[PDB]
Ligand binder design. Structure first.
Ligand code: HEM
Ligand code: NO2
Ligand code: H2S
Length: 152
């Protein structure tokens, strides 16, 4: 788990996302898709996009970015007591969307990158530590459900 101090830092950083959830959610998926084009292939409805500019221009991409980061935000605000929130995501991502856990690692990395890129000099070493631990906690708990489902 995380200490109370660490959860405080996590949710303080999340304040930055909450002020522009769609812009942050869009940049996260653009960073995913451009750094790891295999990820793009899991979305039939984005799979049409060839270029980053079409990605930037895509209002449905922004919308999905909003859906995804809102769901992460809700999970983070449970400070690890997130069993009921994780279950359906584990199930849909492992069994319907067929998303290898490695791609959730790429996604977590993309969140860190995007925070530094939008807030350079304002995402301090303590905050990156705490945010990385929360994301790892999420991945570990999801990984347990994937194992249960035989996906990984
Ligand atoms: C923190 C990580 C993530 C969160 C919180 C998240 C959340 C969500 C949510 C709330 C939905 C809609 C509800 C559902 O289908 O369960 C969704 C749909 C989906 N997610 Fe994720 N997701 C995450 C990571 C990923 C990653 C890494 C990928 C692929 C590389 C992915 C692929 C998808 C796909 C394909 C859909 C279906 C999209 C559609 O409507 O056509 N997700 N995600
Ligand atoms: O909760 N103090 O690390
Ligand atoms: S997603």
């Amino acid at each position: 788990g995380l200490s109370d101090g660490e959860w405080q830092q996590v949710l303080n950083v999340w304040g930055k996302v909450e002020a522009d959830i769609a812009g942050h959610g869009q940049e996260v998926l653009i960073r995913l898709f451009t750094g790891h084009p295999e990820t793009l292939e899991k979305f039939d409805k984005f799979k049409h996009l060839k270029t980053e500019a079409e990605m930037k221009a895509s209002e449905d991409l922004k919308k999905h970015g909003t859906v995804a980061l809102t769901a992460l935000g809700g999970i983070l605000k449970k400070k690890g007591h997130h069993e009921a929130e994780l279950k359906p995501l584990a199930q849909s991502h492992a069994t319907k969307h067929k998303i290898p856990i490695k791609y959730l690692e790429f996604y977590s990395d993309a969140i860190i990158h995007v925070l530094h890129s939008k807030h350079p000099g304002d995402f301090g070493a303590d905050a990156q530590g705490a945010m990385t631990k929360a994301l790892e906690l999420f991945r570990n708990d999801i990984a347990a459900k994937y194992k249960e489902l035989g996906f990984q």
